[PDB]
From Swiss-Prot, chain B:
<feature type="coiled-coil region">
    <location>
        <begin position="1"/>
        <end position="20"/>
    </location>
</feature>
<protein>
    <recommendedName>
        <fullName>Flagellin D</fullName>
    </recommendedName>
</protein>
<comment type="subunit">
    <text>Heteromer of multiple flagellin subunits including FlaA, FlaB, FlaC, FlaD and FlaE.</text>
</comment>
<comment type="similarity">
    <text>Belongs to the bacterial flagellin family.</text>
</comment>
<comment type="function">
    <text>Flagellin is the subunit protein which polymerizes to form the filaments of bacterial flagella. FlaD is not essential for flagellar synthesis and motility.</text>
</comment>
Amino acid sequence: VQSRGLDVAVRNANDGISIAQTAEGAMNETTNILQRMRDLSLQSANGSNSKSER
Amino acid sequence: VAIQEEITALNDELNRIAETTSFGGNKLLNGTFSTKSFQIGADNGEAVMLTLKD
């Protein structure tokens, strides 16, 4: 009983790390987009930019 | 009188330079640039104030 159960346990864990792996991957793109927004934001702050540029 | 003609023309030119000099379309010496802040910083609130006058 324990041996068979241990196998199922491992599988469940692997699936767990899978969900986390997939989720983490999305967050990776999320940050990159956020960072670009920050850089664009700094550029907008510069007084040189006109309302059109903003 | 003739010298005044030259003075008249040159004061017009001064006025012109003042209401024409622009950067990409943002006028500079007309008296509208006033004060602007250039971020010059990797984080918020690190800008410096440039004040152009008429």
